[PDB]
Design an enzyme around this catalytic site. Structure first.
Site, PDB file in Angstrom:
ATOM      1  N   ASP A   1       0.263  -0.695   5.521  1.00  0.00           N
ATOM      2  CA  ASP A   1      -0.728  -1.391   4.693  1.00  0.00           C
ATOM      3  C   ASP A   1      -2.447  -0.305   5.280  1.00  0.00           C
ATOM      4  OD1 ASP A   1      -3.165  -3.629   4.032  1.00  0.00           O
ATOM      5  OD2 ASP A   1      -1.174  -4.256   3.624  1.00  0.00           O
ATOM      6  N   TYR A   2      -2.903   0.055   4.399  1.00  0.00           N
ATOM      7  CA  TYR A   2      -4.072   0.782   4.428  1.00  0.00           C
ATOM      8  C   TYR A   2      -4.920  -0.572   4.731  1.00  0.00           C
ATOM      9  CZ  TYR A   2      -1.977   5.141   3.002  1.00  0.00           C
ATOM     10  OH  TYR A   2      -1.187   5.745   2.413  1.00  0.00           O
TER      11      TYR A   2
ATOM     12  N   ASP B   1       0.780  -1.177  -0.418  1.00  0.00           N
ATOM     13  CA  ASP B   1       0.001   0.055  -0.271  1.00  0.00           C
ATOM     14  C   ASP B   1       1.079   1.427   0.152  1.00  0.00           C
ATOM     15  OD1 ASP B   1      -2.416  -0.638  -0.306  1.00  0.00           O
ATOM     16  OD2 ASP B   1      -3.103  -1.342   1.815  1.00  0.00           O
TER      17      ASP B   1
HETATM   18 CA   LIG Z   1      -4.566  -2.796   2.062  1.00  0.00          CA
END
Ligand SMILES: [Ca+2]
Lengths: 148, 245, 99, 408, 147, 204
Positions: free
Chosen positions: E96-97, E83
Site C-alpha cells: 500500500d503506497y 495498491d
Molecule cells: Ca494507498
C-alpha cells in the site's frame, strides 16, 4: 377557387400544391386537419389524391403552440389507431371513417400502412414553426452556417 | 457566446433559402417533406411566408395546405402580420371555407352573422371578406332560459347619457356585469337559469360564466366588482410571478 | 369595432346609438339599459363531512444492507469524494505553507 | 469454441458463467477473469453477484468490446501499437490541421465557405470533431469504404459528402504517415487478424483462456466475425439475454431458412428449436422475403428492432454453438402474462375481426380487479409524480416483505 | 524542475528492501505483480463494531491502541482496492503506497512515528481487511492453497 | 485536472502545431464535464433512481418508469445528416431511437414482480392536456385488447378493453392534501402530515 371560396369537402380536396383553407370560428379546423392527414397517409382521394402514399416522417405539419403540436400529435395517433382498426373489421359505424372506408381499395393493406404509421408516431413531423426551423437548419448546417 | 434565440432560428432559415446555396437547401427540404400543412397561418409574418413559398410554391410533386382564419389574427404586437397573410392570399388561387359552425347555438350563430354582415368589408380590408356560416343540426335545440323564458343569444347593455368617459364606462360596466352574474348564479341555485339542449337542462354554475377582457387592469376592475358580491373569481391570463407575492 | 358595426360607420348622436341598436334587434339580438344593481349576497351555503384517515404502515426499519469499504472508519467530508473519483488518494488532505 | 448462450434472464446466464468459473479452475497467476461488459452497472451487478456465490470477486477485467478486440490485435498480430493512431480524439486534432489546407479544392467547396464567414476556430474544431466521429464509426460499420477511399476510389450508392469524406480520409491517412505513426486502424487490421487466426491452425499464441461477454445486446458484424475467429483457440462464452425462445429475426434467401432450422442444445441437456415443423417457416414466418411478417408478439414486434438485428447476426455464424437456457413464465399476473406472451412469441390481442370474435369478451384473459403488477399513473407534475410514487413504494414494501429496497 | 528530486526519489523507493529477504520492488517483473486489484467481500450477519474490536485486540499488538469500534452495524458488501499484490516465488504480498502528510523531515518516518500514524488513521483496520481479501482471493484461485 | 490533462495530451499526441485559444479548451472541458456521469452508488444503499441506460439491463422485483411522456421518452437526436451511414442502413447499425425503444422492452422483461409506469397528465398552468409516450400507449393498448375484468364477460371488444385501461390508469390529484388521497383504498397516502389539511381540521 377565384372569388368567394368553395365550401371545402375534405374528402375531395385536391392534395396537389397550394391550397388556402379558411376555417371560421367553431368550424372543425381540427377535424379537417385529421381527415387530410389520413387521406395523405393512405394516398386516398381520387384525381384529388396525392401522387403517392406518404409516411408519418413526410407529412409536415407546423403549428404555433408547443401545446398545439402536442394536442395535434395526440389527436392524430388516435385517428390512425382507429381508421386502422375499422380497417381490420372492414366496418365502421361512425362518420368520417365510413366515407374514408368507402374510398379505400384494399382495407387489408391500409391496416398495415396505418399500423406502421401508428408505430412511427413518436416521430411524426409535427413541429412548431421554430422546431421546424432548427431542424432544417441543423441538418443542412453547411448551407445555414450553423454550429453543430 | 455560441447562442440562438427564437427569431434567429427562422431568420437564419430565411437567409439560407436566399443565399446562393439556397437551392440545394430548398430541394433538400422539399424532398423530406413533399407536402406540408401549415395551421394557424393567419398568424405568420414575412420571414415565415417567404421560407414557405421559396420551398413549396409552384413546385410540382408537392402540396401546401395553408389553413387558418384571417378574422382571428390578433397577434399584431408579437409580430404576426395580417398583411403577409393577405399577400399570400393573392398568390395562391385555390380558396376554400368550412361552412358549418359545430359548437354553437343557432341564435348565437345568427346574431354574429347578422352583426358582421351589416356593412360590406366588415373587417374593412376587402381581402378579409366576411362570409356567414350555418349552425349545425346537432345544436338546433340549445337555448338558455332565465327566471321564466328563453333569453336571446346576444344582449347589448346600454349606458344612459350623452357623453361618457372611459373611467365611468367601466365602474358602471363592471358593476352591471357583476350584478347580472350573481343574478344568474343564484337564479341558477334555484333552478331558474338553465342551459338547455331541447328537453335537457342543467343549472348555470360559476364554471360557465366567463368574462373576456382586454388587460390586466380591466380584469381587476371585474374581479373587484365581482368580489364585492362575494362571487369568487380567477384571472386565467394572470402573469404575475410567485416571487412578488 | 363594435361601434363601427353598430353605427354602420358614420358617427352618431349619443341617441343615434340607441336607435341603431334597436334597429337590428329581435330574439337573437336584444338590448336593455345599463341596469345597475346592489345586493352584496351570492346567497350560497355549504355542507361538509370530512370522514378521513391515513394508511399507517406496520412494517419496520430493522436492518440495513449496504456496500461499505473502510469508510466504516474514515468519517465524512468524503461525501461525494469517493463518488466523483473512485480512486482519489482519499488518505491525504490539507494545505502546505512556509516549509 | 465461441459458445453462445441464449436465456430468458440474466440470472441464468450469470449462473452458467458462475458455473464455468467453478469447473475449469482457471489458472491462478494473477490472470484476470475477463468480462466484456458495456456499462459500469453490469460490471457492478456482476462483481456483487459473483462475490456472493464465491465469497469474493477480485480480478475480473471489464473491457468494452472495442477495447478488447484491439487488445487481442496487439496480442495476435506482430507489432501493433497499444492505442491506435486513429482514435476518435487524436484524429480530431490531425483533421483540424488538415482541413484548412485541403480547402479551396472545389472538392471541399462546401466546407470552404462554411469555414470562412467567421471563426476563431470554433467551426473548424467542431467540424474536425463530428468528422473525426464519423470516421470512428465507419471504422466499425463500413470498414470497407475506408480501404476504398484511401486509394482514391469512391463507393457507388452513397450520398454526396462522400465527395469530401473520401478525399478527406485519404488526406488523414497519408498525413498520419508523414507524422510517422502506426498506419494500423481497426479496418485495415481486422481481416488480417481473422486470417492469421483462421489459419495458423496450430495453437493460441499468448491470449487469455476464457472470455465472457455479459449483458450486451448488440455487437457490430465485424466484431462478431473477429470474435468467432478468436473462438477457435480461446474459450468464448457470450451470454446474450433474449426476450424470446424462438427465432423472431429476419431471413435472407429461401436457401438460408433451413440452415437455421437447426437446433440449439441446453447448456446442460438434449436439444430444442422454433415450433411447427415447416408451416412456420412458411405460414407467414418469413413472408415478405424480408422480415417475419407475424413476429407473434406485437410488442416484441415494434420495440425490439435492435434485438432482431443482433439475433439475426448471431445465427449467421458458423463456428458458433448456440444453446437454450430459457426459463418459463407461468401466466398468473397481468405482468407475467405479457412477459409470457413475449417469451412464447404469441399474440393475445383481440382486434375483433368478426361479430363472433368482437361480441363476447371472455376470449380475452380474465383480469382480476385485485392485480397490481403493471399499474399506470397520471399526475400533474414531477413533484406530485414522485410523491405519488413514494406512497406506492411504501405500500408495495408494506404488502410483501422479502421486498428490501435494493430490489427496487 | 521537480524531475531531479523525483526520479531520484522513485528509484530509492524502488530499490528498498521491503522484507529483507530479496524483496525490493525492482526485482518484480510484470508476471509477478497485479496492480489495483478490486475485491468485494460479502459480509452477512451484521458486523458489530464491538464484536470486531475484541478479536482485533487479542491478535494485534498494534490495534491494542484501542480506541476503535467507531462505526455502526452493517450487513452488505465490502468494496476495496489493493495498491499492489506481488509474489516472491511462493509468498504473495499486500503493498500500500501511502503518500502522506508534510511532517517536516525524516524524524517523522521512523518505525514508531509510522506505527503512530498507523493508529491515528486506524489503518491497522485496512491491513486485516485487505488480507482477509487476499486470503479469500488466493484460497479461491490457488486450488489447494494454505494461508 | 484529469479531463483538462487528457484533453491537452490528446492534442499533443496528434502533434497539433498551431497555438490554441482558451475557448477551444474551455468548451471541451465543459462538454467532457457534462458527459461524465456519477453512478457509484448504483447498487448498495437501495432504491435506485437513474435514467434508462443502454447495455445495463438488470432483473429487479420492482421497476418503475416516470415521466414517460410523448416527446420525452423515446429520447431523440437526428444524425448529423452528412452521415452516409445513416441514410443507407444495415443490420448492425445503432440509433438512439432503437436503443431507447429497446430499453423500454428490456424494462418490461426485467421486472420480476411489479412494473410501475408514470407520466405527467397536464401542465399545471394552461391546464392543457398532456400525452403519454407512444411506447406506453402501445403497452396499455395491448393489455386492454387481451384482458377483461371479471364483471364484463359479455359486453364487447372495445367495451371491455376500455374498462381495463380505465382500471389500470389511476388519475392522481393535483395537491397532496386533496381528500381523495385520504379516503380508503387505492393508494391512500402514508403521509399523515397532510391529514389535518385534508380534513379541514385547521384553526383559522
Ligand atoms: Ca494507498
Amino acid at each position: 377557387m377565384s372569388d368567394v371560396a368553395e365550401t371545402l369537402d375534405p374528402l375531395r380536396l385536391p392534395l396537389q400544391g397550394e391550397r388556402l383553407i379558411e376555417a371560421s370560428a367553431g368550424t372543425g379546423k381540427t377535424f379537417t386537419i385529421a381527415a387530410l392527414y389520413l387521406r395523405l397517409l393512405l394516398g386516398l382521394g381520387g384525381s384529388a389524391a396525392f401522387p403517392r402514399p406518404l409516411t408519418v416522417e413526410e407529412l409536415l405539419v407546423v403549428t404555433f403552440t408547443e401545446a398545439a403540436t402536442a394536442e395535434l400529435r395526440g389527436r392524430i395517433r388516435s385517428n390512425i389507431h382507429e381508421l386502422r382498426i375499422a380497417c381490420l373489421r372492414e366496418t365502421t359505424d361512425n362518420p368520417l371513417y365510413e366515407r374514408l372506408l368507402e374510398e379505400i381499395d384494399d382495407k387489408a393493406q391500409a391496416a398495415q400502412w396505418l399500423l406502421l404509421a401508428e408505430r412511427q408516431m413518436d416521430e411524426a413531423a409535427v413541429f412548431t414553426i421554430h422546431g421546424f426551423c432548427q431542424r432544417m437548419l441543423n441538418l443542412n448546417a453547411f448551407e445555414s452556417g450553423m454550429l453543430f | 457566446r455560441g447562442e440562438l434565440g427564437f427569431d434567429d432560428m427562422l431568420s437564419r432559415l430565411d437567409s439560407a433559402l436566399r443565399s446562393e446555396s439556397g437551392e440545394v437547401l430548398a430541394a433538400a427540404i422539399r424532398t423530406r417533406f413533399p407536402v406540408a400543412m401549415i395551421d394557424e397561418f393567419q398568424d405568420t409574418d414575412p420571414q415565415q411566408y417567404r421560407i414557405f413559398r421559396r420551398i413549396w410554391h409552384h413546385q410540382p410533386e408537392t402540396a401546401l395546405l395553408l389553413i387558418g382564419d384571417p378574422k382571428q389574427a390578433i397577434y399584431a404586437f408579437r409580430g404576426a402580420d395580417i398583411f403577409t397573410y393577405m399577400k399570400a392570399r393573392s398568390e395562391v388561387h385555390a380558396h376554400y371555407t368550412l361552412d358549418t359552425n359545430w359548437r354553437s347555438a343557432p341564435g348565437m350563430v345568427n346574431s354574429v352573422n347578422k352583426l358582421f354582415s351589416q356593412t360590406d368589408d366588415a373587417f374593412m380590408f376587402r381581402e378579409i371578406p366576411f362570409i356567414p356560416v350555418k349552425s349545425a343540426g346537432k345544436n338546433q335545440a340549445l337555448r338558455f332560459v332565465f327566471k321564466g323564458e328563453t333569453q336571446p343569444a346576444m344582449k347589448m347593455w346600454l349606458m344612459e347619457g350623452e357623453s361618457c368617459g372611459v373611467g365611468d364606462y367601466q365602474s358602471t360596466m363592471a358593476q352591471v356585469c357583476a350584478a347580472q352574474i350573481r343574478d344568474w348564479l343564484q337564479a341558477g341555485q334555484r333552478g331558474e337559469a338553465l342551459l338547455m339542449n331541447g328537453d335537457d337542462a342543467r343549472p348555470v354554475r360559476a364554471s360557465d360564466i366567463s368574462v373576456l377582457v382586454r388587460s390586466r387592469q380591466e380584469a381587476a376592475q371585474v374581479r373587484d366588482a365581482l368580489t364585492l358580491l362575494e362571487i369568487p373569481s380567477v384571472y386565467l391570463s394572470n402573469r404575475d410571478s410567485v416571487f412578488e407575492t | 369595432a363594435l361601434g363601427r358595426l353598430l353605427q354602420k360607420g358614420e358617427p352618431q348622436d349619443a341617441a343615434g346609438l340607441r336607435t341603431c341598436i334597436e334597429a337590428l334587434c329581435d330574439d337573437d339580438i336584444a338590448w336593455q339599459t345599463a341596469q345597475t344593481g346592489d345586493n352584496q349576497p351570492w346567497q350560497v351555503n355549504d355542507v361538509s363531512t370530512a370522514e378521513l384517515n391515513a394508511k399507517t404502515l406496520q412494517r419496520l426499519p430493522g436492518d440495513n444492507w449496504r456496500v461499505t469499504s473502510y469508510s466504516g472508519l474514515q468519517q465524512r467530508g468524503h461525501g461525494i469524494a469517493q463518488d466523483l473519483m473512485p480512486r482519489l488518494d482519499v488518505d491525504a488532505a490539507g494545505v502546505a505553507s512556509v516549509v | 469454441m465461441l459458445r453462445v448462450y441464449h436465456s430468458n434472464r440474466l440470472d441464468v446466464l450469470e449462473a452458467l458463467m458462475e458455473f464455468i468459473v467453478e469447473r475449469e479452475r482457471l489458472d491462478d497467476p494473477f490472470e484476470p477473469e475477463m468480462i466484456l461488459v458495456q456499462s459500469t452497472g453490469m460490471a457492478q451487478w456482476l462483481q456483487m453477484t459473483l462475490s456472493q456465490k464465491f465469497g469474493i470477486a477480485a480480478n475480473i477485467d471489464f473491457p468494452l468490446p472495442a477495447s478488447f478486440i484491439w487488445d487481442m490485435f496487439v496480442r495476435v498480430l506482430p507489432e501493433i501499437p497499444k492505442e491506435s493512431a486513429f482514435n476518435k480524439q487524436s484524429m480530431s486534432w490531425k483533421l483540424m490541421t488538415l482541413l484548412p489546407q485541403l480547402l479551396e479544392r472545389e472538392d471541399f467547396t462546401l466546407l470552404r465557405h462554411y469555414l470562412t464567414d467567421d471563426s476563431d476556430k470554433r467551426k473548424l474544431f467542431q467540424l474536425s470533431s463530428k468528422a473525426a466521429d464519423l470516421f470512428d464509426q465507419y471504422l466499425v460499420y463500413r470498414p470497407d469504404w475506408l480501404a476504398q477511399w484511401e486509394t482514391g476510389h469512391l463507393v457507388e450508392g452513397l450520398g454526396e459528402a462522400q465527395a469530401w469524406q473520401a478525399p478527406l480520409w485519404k488526406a488523414l491517412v497519408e498525413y498520419t504517415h508523414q507524422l510517422g505513426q502506426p498506419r494500423w486502424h481497426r479496418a485495415n487490421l481486422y481481416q488480417r487478424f481473422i486470417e492469421t487466426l483462421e489459419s495458423a491452425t496450430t495453437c493460441p499464441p499468448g491470449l487469455p483462456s476464457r472470455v465472457f461477454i455479459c449483458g450486451i445486446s448488440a455487437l457490430p458484424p465485424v466484431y462478431l466475425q473477429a470474435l468467432q475467429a478468436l473462438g477457435k483457440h480461446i474459450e468464448i462464452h457470450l451470454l446474450f439475454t433474449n426476450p424470446c425462445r424462438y427465432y423472431w429475426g429476419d431471413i435472407k434467401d429461401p436457401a438460408y431458412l433451413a440452415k437455421l432450422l437447426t437446433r440449439q442444445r441446453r447448456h446442460s441437456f438434449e436439444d430444442r428449436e422454433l415450433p411447427l415443423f415447416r408451416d412456420s417457416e412458411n405460414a407467414g414466418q418469413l413472408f415478405n422475403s424480408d422480415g417475419e411478417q407475424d413476429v407473434g408478439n406485437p410488442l416484441l414486434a415494434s420495440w425490439g428492432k435492435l434485438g432482431r438485428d443482433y439475433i439475426y447476426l448471431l445465427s449467421d455464424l458458423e463456428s458458433s454453438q448456440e444453446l437454450d437456457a430459457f426459463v418459463d413464465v407461468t401466466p398468473d399476473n397481468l405482468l407475467h402474462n405479457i412477459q409470457s406472451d413475449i417469451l412464447e412469441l404469441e399474440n393475445r390481442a383481440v382486434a375483433g375481426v368478426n361479430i363472433e370474435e368482437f361480441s363476447r369478451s371472455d376470449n380475452k384473459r380474465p383480469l382480476d380487479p385485485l392485480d397490481s403488477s403493471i399499474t399506470f399513473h397520471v399526475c400533474h407534475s414531477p413533484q406530485r409524480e414522485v410523491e405519488v410514487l413514494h406512497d406506492r413504494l411504501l405500500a408495495m414494501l408494506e404488502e410483501d416483505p422479502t421486498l428490501t429496497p435494493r430490489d427496487i | 524542475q521537480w524531475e531531479p528530486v523525483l526520479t531520484e526519489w522513485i528509484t530509492a523507493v524502488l530499490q528498498a528492501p521491503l522484507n529483507e529477504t530479496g524483496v525490493s520492488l525492482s526485482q518484480l517483473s510484470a508476471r509477478n505483480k497485479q496492480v489495483e486489484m478490486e475485491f468485494y467481500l460479502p459480509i452477512s450477519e451484521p458486523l458489530i463494531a464491538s464484536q470486531l474490536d475484541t478479536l482485533i485486540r487479542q491478535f494485534d499488538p498494534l490495534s491494542a491502541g484501542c480506541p476503535p469500534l467507531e462505526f455502526m452495524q452493517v450487513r452488505g458488501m465490502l468494496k476495496g482496492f489493493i495498491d499492489l499484490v506481488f509474489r516472491h516465488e511462493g509468498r504473495y504480498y499486500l503493498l500500500d503506497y501511502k503518500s502522506n502528510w508534510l511532517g517536516e523531515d525524516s524524524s517523522a518516518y521512523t518505525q514508531q512515528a509510522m506505527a503512530a500514524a498507523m493508529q491515528a488513521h486506524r489503518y491497522d483496520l485496512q491491513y486485516q481487511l485487505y488480507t482477509l481479501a487476499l486470503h479469500r482471493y488466493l484460497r479461491h484461485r490457488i486450488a489447494d492453497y494454505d494461508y | 485536472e484529469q479531463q483538462w490533462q487528457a484533453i491537452i495530451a490528446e492534442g499533443l499526441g496528434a502533434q497539433y502545431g498551431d497555438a490554441v485559444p482558451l475557448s477551444l479548451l474551455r468548451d471541451e472541458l465543459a462538454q467532457r464535464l457534462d458527459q461524465e456521469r456519477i453512478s457509484q452508488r448504483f447498487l448498495a444503499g437501495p432504491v435506485n433512481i437513474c435514467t434508462l441506460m443502454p447495455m445495463r439491463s438488470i432483473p429487479f422485483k420492482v421497476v418503475c418508469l416516470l415521466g414517460m411522456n410523448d416527446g420525452v421518452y423515446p429520447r431523440q437526436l437526428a444524425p448529423l445528416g452528412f452521415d452516409l451511414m445513416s441514410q443507407k442502413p444495415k443490420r448492425g447499425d445503432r440509433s438512439r431511437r432503437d436503443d431507447d425503444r429497446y430499453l423500454f422492452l428490456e424494462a418490461l422483461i426485467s421486472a420480476q414482480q411489479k412494473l410501475y409506469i408514470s407520466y405527467i397528465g397536464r401542465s399545471i398552468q394552461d391546464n392543457s392536456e398532456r400525452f403519454p409516450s407512444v411506447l406506453v400507449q402501445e403497452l396499455i393498448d395491448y393489455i386492454g385488447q387481451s384482458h377483461y375484468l371479471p364483471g364484463d364477460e359479455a359486453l364487447n371488444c372495445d367495451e371491455s378493453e376500455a374498462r381495463v385501461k380505465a382500471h389500470l390508469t389511476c388519475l392522481h390529484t393535483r395537491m397532496p392534501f386533496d381528500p381523495q388521497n385520504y379516503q380508503p383504498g387505492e393508494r391512500q397516502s402514508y403521509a399523515r402530515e397532510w391529514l389535518p389539511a385534508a380534513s379541514q381540521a385547521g384553526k383559522a
